[PDB]
Design an enzyme around this catalytic site. Structure first.
Site, PDB file in Angstrom:
ATOM      1  N   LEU A   1       0.818  -1.613  -0.487  1.00 45.49           N
ATOM      2  CA  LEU A   1      -0.025  -0.084  -0.695  1.00 45.49           C
ATOM      3  C   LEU A   1       0.668   1.518  -0.557  1.00 45.49           C
ATOM      4  O   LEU A   1       0.299   2.608  -0.340  1.00 45.49           O
ATOM      5  CB  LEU A   1      -0.968  -0.104   1.004  1.00 45.49           C
ATOM      6  CG  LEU A   1      -2.245   0.687   1.545  1.00 45.49           C
ATOM      7  CD1 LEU A   1      -3.168   0.642   2.068  1.00 45.49           C
ATOM      8  CD2 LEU A   1      -2.067   2.261   1.803  1.00 45.49           C
ATOM      9  N   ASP A   2       1.922   1.537   0.736  1.00 46.48           N
ATOM     10  CA  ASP A   2       3.193   2.357   0.302  1.00 46.48           C
ATOM     11  C   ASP A   2       4.041   2.072  -0.425  1.00 46.48           C
ATOM     12  O   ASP A   2       5.154   3.098  -0.352  1.00 46.48           O
ATOM     13  CB  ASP A   2       3.430   2.544   2.349  1.00 46.48           C
ATOM     14  CG  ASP A   2       3.176   3.060   3.148  1.00 46.48           C
ATOM     15  OD1 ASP A   2       2.065   3.965   2.521  1.00 46.48           O
ATOM     16  OD2 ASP A   2       3.076   3.140   4.094  1.00 46.48           O
ATOM     17  N   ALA A   3       4.155   1.781  -1.337  1.00 43.11           N
ATOM     18  CA  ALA A   3       4.883   0.997  -1.783  1.00 43.11           C
ATOM     19  C   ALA A   3       5.484   2.502  -3.283  1.00 43.11           C
ATOM     20  O   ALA A   3       6.566   3.324  -3.317  1.00 43.11           O
ATOM     21  CB  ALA A   3       4.718   0.075  -3.295  1.00 43.11           C
TER      22      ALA A   3
END
Lengths: 83, 48
Positions: A59-61
């Site tokens: 989700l934070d890539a």
């Protein structure tokens, strides 16, 4: 020169601003189902918690890439060197 | 009558109506299912 620098400040605000908007909505969708899973299967919450962190990294890539580029534009602007 | 033993048949009367941590997934609705289960339970105590 001022138009390149001024528009760069707005580029920076768009990079981290859209990243903040998407990660906060994304963790509300993800985290909302985690609390529901913990309420239905209370003894399994340690497994559900471990499964959640595998999605958090994905989700934070792209959002952390935007944050890294935003700080790069503020302290080492790659457009000011382009005349 | 209730089968107390091979020598005893106790006549009796009992009321049919009116009557842990985790929770169940309900399909289609909980109310829909409670209505079905209660009839199966009374028809079961009558057969018993």
């Amino acid at each position: 020169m001022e138009t390149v620098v001024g528009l760069t400040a707005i580029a920076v605000a768009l990079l981290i601003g859209l990243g903040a908007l998407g990660t906060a909505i994304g963790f509300g969708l993800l985290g909302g189902k985690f609390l529901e899973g913990a309420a239905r299967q209370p003894e399994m919450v340690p497994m559900l918690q471990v499964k959640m962190f595998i999605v958090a990294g994905l989700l934070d890539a792209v959002t952390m890439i935007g944050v890294g580029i935003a700080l790069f534009f503020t302290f080492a602007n790659p457009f000011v060197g382009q005349i | 009558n209730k089968f107390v033993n091979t020598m005893t048949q106790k006549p009796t009367v009992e009321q049919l109506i009116p009557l842990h941590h985790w929770d169940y997934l309900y399909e289609p609705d909980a109310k829909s299912l409670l209505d079905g289960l209660l009839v199966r339970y009374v028809e079961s105590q009558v057969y018993q």
